[PDB]
């Protein structure tokens, strides 16, 4: 189907219901995220990369998200009875700002002691995803739970919004826009 893991889409194309059919797409593993990230920043969005603290995804993630698009990303667990989550970053680099958008997920095997987590934030020149990002995104920089919509500036004109929801098979969804717009 037009539902596919490591693609682009429309951005208007990009709601929760839409994230539910990709999750069902995905391997069937116990934790998984469906991630759509809408880039409606003006700008283009290139040089895709991930980070995984721990898991994996089957698609790559898209070279590109231009200005209008969404991208659509399935960070999953390893398979089987390892006792372990899906922890990890994507980041694009955005020439037109002289920014890199890094966008971080946790969802953790253990709900006995952790909870699901995700951020955004801007970095400056094109920084590929790595573990300084993920730590910085979880440890120090605000991250949020999955407990409703929420909103954050990014700098260089820029905010997004998104909302995680709470379960092990979870969906991420946020939008990525110019301060003057109205997403909350």
């Not at 194309?13 to 999750?23: A, C, K, S, V, Y």
């Amino acid at each position: 189907a037009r539902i596919a893991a490591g693609t682009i889409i429309a951005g208007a194309e990009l709601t929760i219901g839409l994230l539910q059919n990709l999750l069902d797409v995905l391997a069937n593993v116990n934790r998984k995220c469906a991630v759509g990230v809408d880039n409606e920043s003006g700008f283009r969005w290139q040089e895709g990369s991930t980070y995984f603290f721990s898991g994996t995804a089957d698609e790559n993630l898209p070279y590109s998200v231009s200005d209008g698009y969404a991208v659509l990303y399935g960070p999953r667990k390893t398979n089987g009875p390892v006792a372990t989550g899906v922890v990890g970053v994507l980041a694009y680099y955005i020439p037109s700002i002289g920014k890199t958008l890094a966008v971080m997920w946790s969802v953790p095997f253990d709900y006995n002691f952790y909870q699901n987590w995700w951020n955004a934030k801007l970095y400056s020149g094109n920084q590929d995803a790595d573990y300084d990002h993920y730590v910085d995104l979880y440890y120090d920089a605000n991250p949020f739970k999955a407990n409703g919509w929420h909103e954050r500036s990014l700098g260089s004109g820029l905010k997004f919004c998104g909302s995680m929801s709470s379960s092990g098979q979870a969906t991420l969804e946020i939008h990525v826009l110019k301060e003057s717009e109205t997403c909350m």
